[PDB]
PDB file of C-alpha atoms in Angstrom:
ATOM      1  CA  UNK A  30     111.871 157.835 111.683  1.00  0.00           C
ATOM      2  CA  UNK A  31     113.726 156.855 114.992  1.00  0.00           C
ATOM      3  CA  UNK A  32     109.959 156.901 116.961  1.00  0.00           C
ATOM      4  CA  UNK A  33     109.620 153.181 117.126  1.00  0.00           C
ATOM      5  CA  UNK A  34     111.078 152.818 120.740  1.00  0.00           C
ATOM      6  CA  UNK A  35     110.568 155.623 122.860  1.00  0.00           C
ATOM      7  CA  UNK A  36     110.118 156.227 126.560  1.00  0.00           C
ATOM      8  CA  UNK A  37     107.030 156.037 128.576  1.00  0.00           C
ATOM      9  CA  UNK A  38     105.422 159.677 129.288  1.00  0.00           C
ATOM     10  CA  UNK A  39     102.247 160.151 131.159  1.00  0.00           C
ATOM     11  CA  UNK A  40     102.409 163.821 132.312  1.00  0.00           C
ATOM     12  CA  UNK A  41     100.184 165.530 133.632  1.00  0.00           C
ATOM     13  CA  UNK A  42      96.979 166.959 132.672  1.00  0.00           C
ATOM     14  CA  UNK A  43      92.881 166.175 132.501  1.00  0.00           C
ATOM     15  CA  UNK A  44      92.891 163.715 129.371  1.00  0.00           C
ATOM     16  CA  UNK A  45      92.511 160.275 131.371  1.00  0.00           C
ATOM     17  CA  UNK A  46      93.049 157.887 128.364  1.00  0.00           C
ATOM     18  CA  UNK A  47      94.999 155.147 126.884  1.00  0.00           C
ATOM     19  CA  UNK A  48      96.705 155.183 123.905  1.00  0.00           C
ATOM     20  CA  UNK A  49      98.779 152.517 121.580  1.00  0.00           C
ATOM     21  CA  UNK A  50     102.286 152.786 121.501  1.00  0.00           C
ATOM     22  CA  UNK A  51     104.829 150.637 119.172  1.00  0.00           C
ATOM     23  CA  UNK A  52     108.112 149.576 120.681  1.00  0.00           C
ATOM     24  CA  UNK A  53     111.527 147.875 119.097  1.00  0.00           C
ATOM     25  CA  UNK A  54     113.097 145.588 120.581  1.00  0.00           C
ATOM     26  CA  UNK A  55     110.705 142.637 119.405  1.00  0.00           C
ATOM     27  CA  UNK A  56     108.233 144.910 117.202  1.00  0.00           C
ATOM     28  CA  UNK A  57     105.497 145.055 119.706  1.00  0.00           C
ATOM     29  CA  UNK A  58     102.412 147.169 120.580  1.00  0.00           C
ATOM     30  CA  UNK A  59     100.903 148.052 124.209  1.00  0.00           C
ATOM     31  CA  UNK A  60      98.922 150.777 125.819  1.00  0.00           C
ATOM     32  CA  UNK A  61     100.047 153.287 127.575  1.00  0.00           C
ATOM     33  CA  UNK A  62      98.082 156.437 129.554  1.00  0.00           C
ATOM     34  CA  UNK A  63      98.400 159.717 128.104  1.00  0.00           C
ATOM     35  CA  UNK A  64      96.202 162.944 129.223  1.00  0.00           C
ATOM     36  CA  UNK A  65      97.774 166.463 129.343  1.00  0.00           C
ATOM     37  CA  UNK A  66     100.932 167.573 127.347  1.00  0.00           C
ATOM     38  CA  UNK A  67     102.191 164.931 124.997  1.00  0.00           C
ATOM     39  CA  UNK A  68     105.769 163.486 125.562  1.00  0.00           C
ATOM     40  CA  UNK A  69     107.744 161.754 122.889  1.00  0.00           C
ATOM     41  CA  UNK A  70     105.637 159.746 120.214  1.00  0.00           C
ATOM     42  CA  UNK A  71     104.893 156.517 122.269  1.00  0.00           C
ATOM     43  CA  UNK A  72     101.380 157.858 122.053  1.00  0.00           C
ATOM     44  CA  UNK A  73      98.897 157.282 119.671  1.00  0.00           C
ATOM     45  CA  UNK A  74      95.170 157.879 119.316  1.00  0.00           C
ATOM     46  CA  UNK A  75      94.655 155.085 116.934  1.00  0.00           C
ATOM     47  CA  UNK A  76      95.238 151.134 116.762  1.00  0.00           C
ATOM     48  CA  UNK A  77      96.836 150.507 113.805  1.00  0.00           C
ATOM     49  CA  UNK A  78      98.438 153.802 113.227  1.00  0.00           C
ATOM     50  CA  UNK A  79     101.059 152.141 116.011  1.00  0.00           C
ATOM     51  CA  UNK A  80     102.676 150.191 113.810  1.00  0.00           C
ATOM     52  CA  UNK A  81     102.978 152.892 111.879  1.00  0.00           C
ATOM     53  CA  UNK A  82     105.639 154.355 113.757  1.00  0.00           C
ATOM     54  CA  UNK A  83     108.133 151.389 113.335  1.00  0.00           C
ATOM     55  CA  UNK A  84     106.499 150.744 109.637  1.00  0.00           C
ATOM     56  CA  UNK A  85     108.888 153.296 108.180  1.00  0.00           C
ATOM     57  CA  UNK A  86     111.971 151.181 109.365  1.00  0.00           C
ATOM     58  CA  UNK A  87     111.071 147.543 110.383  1.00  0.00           C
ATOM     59  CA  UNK A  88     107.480 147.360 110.970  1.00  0.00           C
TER      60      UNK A  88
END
């Protein structure tokens, strides 16, 4: 479960929304905009869930 820190991908596409991404580095969550083909897992249609990603390993 290495999808804690991933790269930002916004692509393109006609889904204009933000979504919650976890990062390492510090174990933080942001948003990010994501609307179209989905790149890496930085993306996330739910709060919580974020943490999720990292929750398998440090989180």
């Amino acid at each position: 479960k290495k999808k804690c820190q991933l790269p930002s991908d916004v692509g393109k596409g006609k889904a204009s929304f933000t979504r919650y991404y976890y990062n390492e580095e510090s174990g933080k969550c942001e948003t990010f905009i994501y609307g179209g083909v989905g790149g890496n897992s930085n993306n996330f249609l739910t709060k919580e869930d974020c943490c999720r990603e990292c929750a398998q390993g440090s989180c």
